[PDB]
Symmetry: C5
Subunit: 314 residues, 5 copies
């Protein structure tokens, strides 16, 4: 896929368009009114290059934009702030989660964006812009980021939800469903949970590090805003920790459950054994080729003497 | 529910009413005598919105009062100090804990509050101002906050008291009651203890950060008072950690109990089968179609060669 | 119980008595020769109240002396240093430890103590004053504290010694005595260790904080003395963490020992069954109602094709 | 093996050769153009001895170059910098990893290297120089180090990829392949990870030390280059953790898949027993020597009373 | 035992002798040429007392050298530097490790030592002095210290080596030797590892603390030396952890290997049981007392309908 979307807006108005030409966005560098140049489809490296070059982005900072397998970070430069993030997509049921990586380059009045596939969680932001809702138009571009970012971080809540409600189910399946591939299901969660954890802890650190310093900040306007996002990014990485703490000691339940049922089966076998082994032994004697109720009575009394004795076991 | 209580008190005198009108409590802003404007029922967004606009509160902070799914935190501002706390209910028997979110805003001589349902642990703190008991009237309106806060933390101790006695019992249940749902009951405790853990450790931080700084403090009057509640907050978060440390290694005690019971049955089975196998074999042989006490003697001896050989196993 | 002992002493002299009157001790506030006012029995809150009120002790601080369920701490004030400490009693056999809380208040030339029950580990110290042994009399009253403390921390060694020698035994019980109430006897330990380890880790911190600061110290006379009690305090809390780590991987030994014994039983069943199923089957067909050493030969022969085959398994 | 290979180059041009002679490289100490003196074969302690003494290197450092069983480290000196590193080789299938130590000495315009065997992951670096690709020729000799180092670190990624893929398979081996030597295949991995873990966490520290300090650096040319390696270095020593954390809880699946299967076996064995045990006993009673379908029906009716009762277990 | 040894040496010469007299060593105090007054046999408390007093040592400091049950530490004083350490003796095979305590006091030109039994790991040090090997004579008496310590620390490598190889074996013993007291052999390993890990971590800090400060150091002569001991000291403390991480999750393996084998046994027992229970039932029916190849055919066919059905289990 490949599609470039821009949303230049001022305090008063805006336009939007989805051109697939490269050059038709460059002039916006000098635009003194907040623009949002979203470059969906990063597979075309020729485009990032040209843009990179124009805006005065470093060559390595570009490369990072291209290399998806990277830990989220926040780089501070002389001209532009560069952040990378990774939003997720849990395939509910098909227990497995997938990870697109989005890169953000803030410069003057331009929030430059780089997605690798169409679709995101930024719909809410563009439209609040679209039909002027909330305080987005009123404020500058450095805010705009701290809107996109708010948007991304929000998404993780959804997942958590999904996961809580996953846990809730995959808890029940140990307690009272000792079956086969519950086990495998469990281990798919921890896996999922670890994988996640080390993408929030570093993302947490981004909004952590984006808080301490900040050059184009508009101090008491954009800052105390994203404190309330940094705050989110905490809870996220707090919650996770909770999950990875309950999930951790779950398999153990399963085992207790199972090694407890094994007790039951074993027990019945033993009890059946213990009465008809001897009773079939007596009657074995009396197939020897070398009072009929006398033997049955004694048998039938022994088969009691047992079932009694088995009231310390039941 | 919705019921707005107010306790304006000076060094000599106080009143107390229950009006459901939003307006009839605003003029206490400039009342220079310690007020306590309790707002029960945070479902009514319109009333917080009004009182928040009037007291000068930030918009994002109000949002947080309304959003119950948030960690405990304390926010220091130019005019007011904002605090977010959680108080718990443990339903004994039905092993499960429930959580309501109290928020507090101290501004001049107004300890402004926000509960989401009727009923709370602040009964004694309002009663101690009622029949003038202790030093609550005598001291200012920022002290009032550190009377409520003490009440909320003092409740937590009750929860620990319920849980200790719980564990007490639910431990016996592993040692001397190896049954079925003991398993799940225990996992319900860890669950509950993690859930807790993540709600004191932050609350503990509240009273820890509420220590280091503080602008309306009255240094050596109210600060060395809550040092005593920040202390309480520690102990809590230490006790919780003791529990989650004893509860942790409990399933392994059950497992053991049961992977030992397995053995017993497993054992008895084998002695039975081990003896009445061959005896039911010898007495099998002698059902062939192709000294009676010779065979019985030789049977009745082997079954003793076995019993004695089985004094390495008993 | 109630019994207030005192021991004032100078470089030259001392007395000792066991009055049970409250005021007969108050005049020792201004005594410029080291005085040790022991208040055994904290149940008489009135007694505490008076003394406290007299010596100028803060109200909350008095509460702490009466409230036994607290983490050991060292409070620094303008006039007096206030410590809270706990000392234990391990009932050998009945595997269960008990806790009494000692509170200490150092002021000018008064070390003001608070025990709840008669009988302590302070018997050597008063004796060392009694029969002027060592450098006690010689030195001041702040040193006196660091002679009680030492004695408190030195008892803990006794405990560790007990528990070492308790572990040792309860370790053998796993390896070479895989029985029943080993399991519970073990959990009792981790229980007792956690309990403990959350009482030293804090007590450590007291001597750690009593090191970094200190107003009545006599720098190079008392400070480098209790370095070598803060030293001990580290060791104890180092030793405890040793125990809580060995013990930690203990139950897991048991399970393996049992899950291995099960194997033996399981295995012996199978050899038995695996021969005397078919030999009773053979001998089962030859009871059919529709060369005697020919069948005994082929029976006896398979009964070795078996035992031979079972020389991969033994 | 033994084969010393050098690469002196300037902004304009370069040469390469592979002399076995020790002396034909020493004159490059004063070659003002960047020289790369690769010494493959550190077994010849004489060759090392010589080149060391000439370059004014300390003795102890040399030893380290000859000692392979050492943690990677960086040692800063007045004249030169010294680094020790280790690269790895994973034998797929034969689950085991082998470790050659590489050591580096930067001085003026001399990157001095020490391989213990022929073959390395530096093929590209020499190649990029060879066909003047990228910015290698252009920049100084201190930059050259931070090209070797990169290629080495980059190697590690390949390992991680190998293992990820390994994990992915050996994970399926517990889920859906509960066999025998998966057990040992698992541990091995833990074994191999730790071994790794503890060679990255220090190698990570090297590039962490190499970043804070640095005397020959060319500040804003080389220093911000290797940050992006330092970076890598983080990611790796992060990812490792991921793995180590997943694998950790893996054997607990297997165990669970096992204790579950035994249960099936245990069950089958029980129900065959629980029905034919009695039926044969009846048909035992009627082999006594002291309406035919009467018995068969009562048998066959019983055999149904079982199978139905055993619809609670299937 | 008891045998005081001394080795005063200078840039040029030395003597050695093994007096049993306490005084014959005192005069060295003032010797301006490095002396090493090794006092083996600390059971004679009278000796230590005397010399302690003569050198000007503190009384508590002496006690420490007389109390062997103590953590390694580095006390810095006005005149002297005091250090305590421990050296070990792993009884190979008799899986258990023994711990003697060495005590060191550096003062001017007097490295004063305190062993409790004959034999140690300082042999190499004394002789490098004996037959002027290396830079031991050349340098001062401080340096002497950082030669002994080098020697002691160098012993730990032996231990590790002895343990690394112990693990290698006591690992196999799980995979491929599921016997009995292998179990206990691995708990003895953990046991031993923790015992160890609690005396390096502190021995590590001592060379950490000996690094940060140091008064008689000879800055760029003896300091940079022991940097390469502290170094060693870290690796030691590093590898130990590696071990106490492999050995940790080993018992697990053994569990999985035996809960696997319990599966086979269980299995076999089952198949044998699941054919000859009904076949012996058939032939049970035909021992009733109320086409010979007809029954044999139908029995035999079943006994293949089975064997085929059990191609899902093998
Ligand atoms: Mg990059
Ligand atoms: Mg939001
Ligand atoms: Mg939930
Ligand atoms: Mg918020
Ligand atoms: Mg209270
Ligand atoms: Mg088991
Ligand atoms: Mg208190
Ligand atoms: Mg002592
Ligand atoms: Mg000491
Ligand atoms: Mg376990
Ligand atoms: Mg070295
Ligand atoms: Mg690269
Ligand atoms: Mg018959
Ligand atoms: Mg050496």
């Amino acid at each position: 896929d490949f599609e470039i979307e821009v949303m230049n807006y001022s305090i008063e108005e805006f336009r939007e368009f989805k051109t697939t030409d490269v050059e038709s966005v460059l002039p916006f560098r000098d635009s003194s009114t907040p623009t949002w140049i979203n470059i969906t489809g990063i597979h075309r490296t020729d485009v990032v290059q040209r843009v990179g070059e124009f805006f005065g982005i470093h060559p390595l900072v570009l490369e990072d934009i291209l290399n998806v397998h990277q830990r989220p970070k926040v780089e501070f430069f002389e001209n532009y702030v560069f952040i990378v993030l990774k939003m997720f997509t849990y395939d509910k049921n098909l227990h497995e989660l997938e990870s697109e990586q989005v890169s953000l380059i803030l410069t003057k009045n331009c929030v430059l964006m780089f997605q690798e596939k169409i679709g995101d969680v930024f719909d809410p932001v563009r439209e609040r812009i679209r039909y002027n809702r909330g305080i987005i138009r009123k404020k500058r571009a450095d805010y705009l980021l701290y809107s996109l970012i708010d948007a991304l971080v929000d998404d993780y809540f959804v997942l958590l939800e999904k996961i809580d409600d996953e846990i809730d189910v995959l808890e029940e399946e140990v307690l009272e469903r000792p079956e086969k591939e519950t086990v495998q299901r469990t281990h798919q969660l921890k896996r999922n949970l670890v994988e996640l954890a080390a993408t929030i802890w570093p993302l947490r650190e981004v909004l952590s590090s984006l808080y301490r310093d900040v050059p184009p900040l508009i101090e008491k306007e954009t800052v105390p805003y994203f404190r309330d996002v940094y705050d989110h990014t905490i809870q996220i990485a707090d919650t996770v920790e909770t999950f990875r703490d309950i999930v951790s000691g779950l398999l153990d339940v399963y085992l207790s459950s199972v090694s407890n049922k094994t007790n039951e089966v074993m027990k019945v076998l033993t009890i059946i054994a213990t009465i008809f082994m001897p009773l079939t032994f007596i009657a074995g004697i009396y197939g020897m080729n070398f009072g009929y109720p006398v033997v049955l009575a004694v048998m039938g009394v022994i088969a009691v003497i047992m079932v009694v004795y088995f009231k310390k076991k039941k």
